[PDB]
Amino acid sequence: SGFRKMAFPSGKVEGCMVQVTCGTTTLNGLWLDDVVYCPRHVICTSEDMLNPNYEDLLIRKSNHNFLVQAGNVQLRVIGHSMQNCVLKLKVDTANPKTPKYKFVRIQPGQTFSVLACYNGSPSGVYQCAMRPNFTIKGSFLNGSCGSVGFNIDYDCVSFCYMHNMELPTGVHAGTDLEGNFYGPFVDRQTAQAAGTDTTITVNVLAWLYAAVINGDRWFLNRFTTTLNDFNLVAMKYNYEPLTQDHVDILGPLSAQTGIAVLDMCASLKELLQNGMNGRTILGSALLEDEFTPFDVVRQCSGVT
Amino acid sequence: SGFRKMAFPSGKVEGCMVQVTCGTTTLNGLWLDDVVYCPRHVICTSEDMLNPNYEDLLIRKSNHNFLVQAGNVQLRVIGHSMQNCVLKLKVDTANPKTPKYKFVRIQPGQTFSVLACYNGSPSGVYQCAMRPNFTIKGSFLNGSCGSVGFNIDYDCVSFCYMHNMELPTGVHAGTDLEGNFYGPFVDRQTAQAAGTDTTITVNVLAWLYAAVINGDRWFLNRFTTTLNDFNLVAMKYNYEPLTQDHVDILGPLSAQTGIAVLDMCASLKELLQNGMNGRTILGSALLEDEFTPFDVVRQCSGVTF
């Protein structure tokens, strides 16, 4: 028993991380088959970043201007193409450590593991949620750009995130592996509004189920509610509205614990209206929204 | 910027995890050079665990009673020895994925990464603190026994923990890789007192420094305090007493932020006396004690490997 914010084992991703250098600028790349993926702002100086014309900047560059190092091995770049906000560097060698992999665009509310890297070398691994406003609250210092987010389904790595920038607010924005930003962000150093963020309601309910399973039951009340009644309270506290799709996803946790989803909603409603009175749930003094229903099921059934 | 509870990259450890089976019982083993390490209670049935004589139980077993599988490959066991609460199974093949490694006994308050495994297959990775009472608050289901805790210093994996048992209270106890339990625990299914836990004061101060560095500064006061004055408040709130050794370890974070350790102590004192008034520090509504001063420095300076 017990419940922890758990990342996927990072081994399969560690073997794909490389260093990409273009003039002064060094960041991280993802080496899969004979292609290296990295943020296109590798081609920018600190001045360029204020208002870059990426097409014009990339034209000034040739294959030999891209230094790609896999640990101590230097890769030979035989091609370069821009796809949205990512650069695809064709190299002469297939990565022998290429795992079975997919590129996926994740939905807001979904979670993934980040392997934070500097100069193509792994620093650490942690589990993130994509916020409803398409930002992440990561740990990303200078040089962390090109660090990737992923899920693992047995043998298959689903790459969903490549770190691109820190907004002035200190929150993080990135792209899928086709180089399309999550949210309304562009790769230039301007002030950019992230939307109003909201709490991921289905994740909070999943974590309350995790709590009951591990024997934290104090918050279970004598009340029930309707989807409509609950959603009026959700709106007031900046929680995502709960849909029948969400109720359906919580079904297995409902079945295990014998607490109907709407009964757990009534518990959450009372927590929102009355706060927690300085009590804790699974060692947290606030409501946690970075566990999906699938995350709770994985951990509470020991999937490998 | 930003601050997260970060585990070490688990790649070097993943390649060392194997499945060990002895009759009915299956758990995880650590394959380094030509030796597999696992908890000795692999040789026990659920009945044996109530009051096991490990010497007598191990004598009933030979090399061929130990099934060791590395993914899909089966290893040949040519030797078995009991060292404290761990079994060392000598195998005919050196692990070609053996990293540079050390066995270290960690101190209470120190942190490490756990690779939670089932049937010799990695499930997930997370950062733990060894509690002052030598327990850990992990996530460990049936079959997680033999899962290991580690730190990485560039190329070298320091194995410090092997998961052994869940206490009736749902907290976790384990051994070093020489099989010596952390704390007063034994490998039998009895009621065992963990004894009073305390908050790791030096870790809370380190995390307050992490907070200042990342721009959370609301808790900073101009009140100050003495080691003696602070430790009277520490005792009242079940915090470890702060020593000069602890002040010295926080020195670099003090130097970076320009906040003297005793000033940060006065901020912590008011947080303890007055609570946080429903505010958050680095997205937490309570005081976090599972980051060491070295953890904060590593993350706030981007150390790799």
Residue numbers in the entry:
A (entry chain B): 1 to 304
B (entry chain A): 1 to 305
Recite the paper's sentences:
Mpro is a cysteine protease that mediates the cleavage of viral polyproteins during viral replication and is a high-profile antiviral drug target. The emergence of SARS-CoV-2 variants with mutations in Mpro raised the alarm of potential drug resistance.
The structures of H164N (apo and GC-376 bound) and E166Q (apo) were also determined for comparison. H164N is a high-frequency mutation with 4682 occurrences and remained sensitive to all three inhibitors (<4.1-fold change in Ki). Collectively, the results suggest that M49, T135, N142, H164, and Q189 might be able to accommodate multiple mutations without a significant compromise in enzymatic activity and drug sensitivity. S144, H164, E166, H172, and N142 mutants impact the size and hydrophobicity of the S1 binding pocket.
